Amino acid sequence: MIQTPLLIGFIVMALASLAIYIKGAHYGPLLGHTLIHAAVPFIAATAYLCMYLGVGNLIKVDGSVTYLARYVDWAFTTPLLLAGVVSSAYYGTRDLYGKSGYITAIVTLDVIMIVTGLIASLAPYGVIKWVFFAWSCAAFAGVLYLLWKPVASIASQQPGVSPAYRRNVGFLTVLWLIYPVVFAVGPEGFWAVSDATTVWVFLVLDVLAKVVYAFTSERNLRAVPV
Ligand SMILES: CCCCCCCC/C=C/CCCCCCCC(=O)OC[C@@H](O)CO
Ligand SMILES: CCCCCCCC/C=C/CCCCCCCC(=O)OC[C@H](O)CO
Ligand SMILES: CCCCCCCC/C=C/CCCCCCCC(=O)OC[C@H](O)CO
Ligand SMILES: CCCCCCCC/C=C/CCCCCCCC(=O)OC[C@H](O)CO
Ligand SMILES: CCCCCCCC/C=C\CCCCCCCC(=O)OC[C@H](O)CO
Ligand SMILES: *C/C=C(C)/C=C/C=C(C)/C=C/C1=C(C)CCCC1(C)C
């Protein structure tokens, strides 16, 4: 039942929240890295605690379920993750411009992606639901474009962080593209798959996006001399 994956996430995210803070490197730019990558699983563990106990679980007239705790989790964890990716490109340089601006612009596009994704879930099957789905994907495209074109240009102007940035962005892009696919196939969208199947896939996605990525992103940046 759905109660099992929610508890699994709560224990995995809470334990990983401390495990990342303990094992995470506290050297220079990596200090704020593990600090942000320790808050992300702590926010997720709190959300899985809410879903497990029913805080925010909205049920519509057609039987669809909207997890308000999940989207608030995404609304704050995904901007913190992008904040660390954009900041990692500015690592080791005090002479480059746009750090505060790029983070601000990409967080705006990410929050709109998550908020409009919440409106789509709440909407019934129709035009209103899929219009905000396409507008959410449009904002997602702007996050990816910004990540790939502009801030990789900032990383490339100094090695060897540039290959470490490109490897972390490639992992994040493939991982985050799975999320809207689960939305469409699950009850929130087309309802091709059951609600419990979406909970299980989002569990493995979140563990990959918040626990596993936190350790591979650190390993890549660890090699660069900054
Ligand atoms: C790196 C890209 C991402 C890779 C991983 C992507 C897939 C992650 C998913 C993991 C498990 C998916 C399958 C989960 C299947 C769950 C089915 C289930 O609980 O059924 C309940 C009732 O319907 C029974 O009647
Ligand atoms: C390197 C680390 C990688 C970590 C990430 C890879 C994880 C692999 C997949 C696991 C998910 C398994 C999903 C199982 C879905 C069915 C579960 C089920 O039916 O549970 C029993 C039920 O609760 C009682 O009736
Ligand atoms: C330099 C600036 C740094 C700023 C750092 C960012 C702020 C961190 C915020 C975390 C919020 C965590 C919220 C966790 C929400 C869990 C789910 C929940 O509360 O759901 C309620 C439900 O919707 C009722 O029906
Ligand atoms: C780096 C940190 C970045 C932090 C960024 C934080 C952004 C928070 C988003 C706010 C959207 C608020 C409005 C969301 C839309 C309303 C959804 C809602 O509350 O729905 C209730 C439901 O319909 C009842 O039945
Ligand atoms: C650039 C931003 C990201 C862009 C990429 C993300 C959007 C993906 C969209 C569709 C995926 C396809 C989903 C396929 C769902 C099939 C549903 C189906 O066949 O439903 C049958 C029926 O509903 C039985 O009840
Ligand atoms: C740790 C949790 C993560 C990384 C969650 C990510 C979620 C998304 C990238 C969701 C994207 C969506 C769209 C682009 C369109 C449909 C609505 C969403 C919110 C599922």
C-alpha 12 – ligand 4 centre gap (Å): 25
C-alpha 72 – ligand 3 centre gap (Å): 6
200 lines ligand 5 (CB under 6 A): no
Q: Token pair of 40, please?
A: 């992300």
* Technique of determination: X-ray
The two counts, helices (H) then strands (E), for the chain are 9, 2
d(CA 180, CA 203): 14
d(CA 67, CA 38): 23
d(CA 66, CA 54): 11
CB 26 within 8 A of CB 224: no
**Which ligand is closest in space to the CA of residue 111?**
4
Residue 54's identity, in one-letter code, is G
d(CA 92, CA 157): 11
End-to-end Cα separation, the chain, in angstroms: 46
Residue 14's identity, in one-letter code, is A
**Which ligand is closest in space to the CA of residue 40?**
6
**Which ligand is closest in space to the CA of residue 123?**
4
CB-based pocket (< 6 A), ligand 1: 174-175, 178, 194, 196-197, 200-201, 204, 208
The 10 Å Cβ neighbour count of residue 43 is: 19
Q: Bridge partners of 58?
A: 66
> What is the domain extent for residue 135?
1-226
The number of distinct structural domains making up the chain is 1
Residue written as token pair 């039942």? 1
Atom 18, ligand 1: which residue's CA is nearest? 197
